[PDB]
Amino acid sequence: AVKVLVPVAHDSEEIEAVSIIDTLRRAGAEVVVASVEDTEIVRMSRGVCVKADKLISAVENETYDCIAIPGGMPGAERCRDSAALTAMLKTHKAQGKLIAAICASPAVVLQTHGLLQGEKAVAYPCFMDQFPADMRGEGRVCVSNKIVTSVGPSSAIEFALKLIEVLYNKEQAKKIAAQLLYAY
Amino acid sequence: AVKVLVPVAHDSEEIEAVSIIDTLRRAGAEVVVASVEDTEIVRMSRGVCVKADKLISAVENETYDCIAIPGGMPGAERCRDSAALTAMLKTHKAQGKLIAAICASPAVVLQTHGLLQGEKAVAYPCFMDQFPADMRGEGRVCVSNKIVTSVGPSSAIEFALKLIEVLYNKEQAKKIAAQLLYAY
């Protein structure tokens, strides 16, 4: 049993959020889609309306094996500015859980809150200067110890598959790659 | 101005629906996400709850440049068994509009309703024998006159980009490919 939190906000990137959620659930994870807004329904960046499983305030004291943050702007900023999600991230980081982000959120969220110290990371290319030079990693997906980052909407499946590999193993990721028809 | 209908159902494939919707809207299309269920909110195959813009009943008499059908099972069957969507598809087909489907839906919906006559098509590989041998096309995305089909979740972005290319032009599709970071 692997448990993952995916926070969602108004103007979250919908391909990225739903790619993460769908792909992990295929692997058998319990994924909790948690709104950082004052409604369960969020209106994502291209107008897709998603009804979250929970408000983040309802799970603030829960523990997850991974917290995986979708991109989108201003979505990433709304995630950044969520006090509850910020507290959860800081606690999960110190507790050795897997912290993950895609697109803007590695810079807007992870780096703003000092969660990438000693690590490398990637992000949607325009955000790569929000990182000090020595923390700029490489790849469409970048693993750095307990940090996993990734670049954008077309890399959201690759991102989630890496998360499967890290949280389960490479054989479980390869099964889910085959389900999605991803050339692994 | 281009207008596109994307029907959604309980147990529609999330990644595929949202990939289509988000990618087309990025191109400037007006996309109408229309539930074939008796609620605007549909519970997709891996539990992602999406609140459709409209019930399909509300737009049955409308005209679209394209109708683009997400996969998922039993989602494709619920689309297949929608009377309203079936009527829309048959009318749009005769009116020379673009009919599109991904994963199961090229077989479960398009072929079931006789919409692929004289055409080639592809689908999630397990469904390729639901097509007569001479209707089996090639590619992860297959264009056949006014039919566009595609194979699965990891091909949903490629699928939608082809839809942009055919409904707009190749230069518009490349712009949207760059936004999503799809190496086109």
**Could you tell me if A121 and A144 are in contact, meaning their C-beta atoms sit under 8 angstroms apart?**
yes
Q: 3-class DSSP state for residue B47? A: coil
CB B19 within 8 A of CB B157: yes
Distance from CA of A48 to the nearest CA of B (A): 7
Distance (Å, whole) CA A38 – CA B11? 27
Decide: B111 and B102 in contact? Cβ < 8 Å: no
How far does the CA of residue B113 sit from the closest CA of chain A (Å)? Answer: 26
Put simply, the answer to whether A48 touches B26 (Cβ < 8 Å) is no
**Among chain B residues, CA nearest to A46:** B22
A48 touches B: beta carbon within 8 Å: yes
Taking contacts as CB-CB distances below 8 angstroms, the residues of chain A near B178 are: none
The domains located in chain A, with CATH, are 1-184 (3.40.50.880)
CA dihedral A62, A67, A71, A73 (to 10 degrees): 30
Say how far apart CA A47 and CA A45 lie, in whole Å. Answer: 6
Using a CB–CB cutoff of 8 Å, tell me whether A39 touches chain B.
no
Nearest to B13 by CA among B52, B53, B42: B42
Closest CA to A83 of A63, A113, A53: A113
Note whether B48 contacts A23, CB cutoff 8 Å.
no
Whether omega for the bond prior to residue B70 falls within 30 degrees of 0, making it cis, is no
Measured between CB atoms, does B140 come within 8 Å of chain A? yes
CB B82 within 8 A of CB B9: yes
Work out the angle between the directed axes of helices B14-26 and B156-167 (0-180°, nearest 10): 30
Q: Which two tokens stand for residue B30?
A: 């007006």
Full DSSP string of chain A: --EEEEEE-TT--HHHHHHHHHHHHHTT-EEEEEESSSSSEEE-TTS-EEE-SEEGGGGTT---SEEEE---TTHHHHHHT-HHHHHHHHHHHHTT-EEEEETTHIIIIIITTTTTTT--B--SGGGGGGS-GGGB--SSEEEETTEEEE-SGGGHHHHHHHHHHHHS-HHHHHHHHHHHT---
Beta partners for B100? B68, B148
Which value, to the nearest 10 degrees, does the dihedral of the CA atoms of residues B5, A152, A22, A106 take? -140
Q: CA-CA distance, B5 to A177, in Å (whole number)?
A: 29
Do the Cβ atoms of B26 and A46 come within 8 Å?
yes
Interface A-B: count of C-beta contacts within 8 A: 97
Residues 6+ apart with CB under 8 A from B164: B23, B24, B27, B172, B173, B176
Q: Which helix (H) or strand (E) holds B79?
A: helix B75-80
- A41: contact with B, CB 8 A cutoff: yes
Amino acid in position B64: Y
A46/B22 Cβ within 8 A: yes
Q: CB neighbours (10 Å) of residue A37?
A: 17
Determination technique for this PDB entry? X-ray
Quote the tokens at residue A176: 């889910």
Tokens coding B157:
């972005």
Which tokens go with A107?
A: 């810079």
Would you say B122 and B136 are in contact if contact means Cβ atoms under 8 Å apart?
yes
Tokens linked to B27: 């191109």
Facing B19 at nearest CB: one of A15, A33, A179:
A15
With an 8 Å Cβ cutoff, are A25 and B46 in contact? yes
Residue type, B3: K
Tell me B40's DSSP state: S
| Pairwise CB contact (< 8 Å): A48 & B152 | no
Taking CA B150 as the corner, what is the angle to CA B147 and CA B151, rounded to the nearest 5 degrees? 150
Give DSSP secondary structure letters for A135-169. GB--SSEEEETTEEEE-SGGGHHHHHHHHHHHHS-
Say yes or no: B72 contacts chain A, CB-CB below 8 A.
no
Q: Any idea what DSSP says for residue B121?
A: B
Identify the CA nearest to B17 among candidates A129, A149, A46. Answer: A46
- Chain A hits for B152, Cβ within 8 Å: 180-181
Q: Is the minimum CB–CB distance between B150 and chain A shorter than 8 Å?
A: no
The partner residue sitting opposite A51, judged by closest CB among B19, B23, B49, is B49
The alpha-carbon gap from A144 to the nearest alpha carbon of chain B, in Å, equals: 22
Token pair 């949202």 is found at B18
Q: Which two tokens stand for residue A13?
A: 């990137």
CB contact, 8 Å: B154 with chain A?
A: yes
Residue B125 CA to chain centroid, in angstroms? 17
